[PDB]
Amino acid sequence: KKVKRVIDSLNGKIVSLNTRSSELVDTLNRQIDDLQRILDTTEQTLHTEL
Amino acid sequence: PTVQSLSERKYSDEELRQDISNLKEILENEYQELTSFDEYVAELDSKLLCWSPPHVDNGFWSDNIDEFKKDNYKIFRQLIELLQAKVRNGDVNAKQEKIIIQVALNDITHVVELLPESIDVLDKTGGKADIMELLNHSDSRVKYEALKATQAIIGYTFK
Numbered sequence: 001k002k003v004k005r006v007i008d009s010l011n012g013k014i015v016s017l018n019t020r021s022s023e024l025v026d027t028l029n030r031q032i033d034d035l036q037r038i039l040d041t042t043e044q045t046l047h048t049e050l
Numbered sequence: 051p052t053v054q055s056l057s058e059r060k061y062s063d064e065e066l067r068q069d070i071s072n073l074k075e076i077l078e079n080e081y082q083e084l085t086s087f088d089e090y091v092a093e094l095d096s097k098l099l100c101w102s103p104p105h106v107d108n109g110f111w112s113d114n115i116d117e118f119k120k121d122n123y124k125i126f127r128q129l130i131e132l133l134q135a136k137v138r139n140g141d142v143n144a145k146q147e148k149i150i151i152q153v154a155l156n157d158i159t160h161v162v163e164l165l166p167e168s169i170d171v172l173d174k175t176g177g178k179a180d181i182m183e184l185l186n187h188s189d190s191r192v193k194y195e196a197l198k199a200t201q202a203i204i205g206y207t208f209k
Contacts (some may be wrong), residue, residue: 029206034182038200041185045197048190 078103087117090157091125097132099153111160123171126161127198129154130177137180148189155184155195162202175181176208178203 007014017024053074060067081103090110093099104110118125133154136147158177162168172178181203184196 035204035208037182037185038204040199041193042197042201045190045194 067187086114090114094125094128094132097136097150099150099157101153101156105153105157108160108164109159111164115161115165123168126158126168127171127175129157130172130175130180133158134175134180137183142184142187143189148192151184152189152192152195155181155192157197159195159198159202162199162206166206169203172203 004014053070055069056099057074060070077135086091086104089102089104099105115123133151136142136150136154142148142151162172181196184192185200187193187196
């Protein structure tokens with residue numbers, strides 16, 4: 001808990017997994033594209049407004 | 051809104067200035083002074099939601115979050131059901147249904163930004179899915195409001 005006060009002080013973001021390196025990747029790629037589509041919606045609205 | 055612009059451009063005539071000011075007060079006062087929960091529900095009931103001065107105002111939503119909670123924001127879930135339904139039944143992209151949607155998405159956005167616990171309600175109901183659908187849909191105003199809804203959920207999922 002003292003290494004984490006070094007990491008979180010100078011803005012390091014620890015990624016604890018504790019389940020699998022193949023089950024979180026699916027639930028995280030199910031958010032990357034789901035948020036990239038919101039980028040492609042709002043930036044299309046931006047270029048429509050401009 | 052028209053009166054508020056008019057008020058700025060005063061023209062030389064005492065009586066004119068007087069009339070414009072009196073009219074600004076009456077219009078503004080009469081609508082806002084209704085109870086907040088009441089106006090929202092009256093609109094909800096008719097399924098005849100419209101933008102009004104307190105539905106684009108953040109303060110209205112803050113006082114009203116608590117009023118919804120009756121089984122995990124049951125009223126909030128009512129608006130989510132109502133929005134989902136309009137898209138799917140009576141189709142999307144016809145004029146009637148297009149007024150209700152844009153207003154509803156505006157209303158939802160405000161509660162979510164304010165409250166982090168409403169995210170659960172969107173998931174259970176299936177509202178989460180429905181937002182994604184409005185994005186593709188024609189009508190610029192519906193798409194703006196839809197995009198703002200997506201972003202409101204999104205800010206909270208990842209910290």
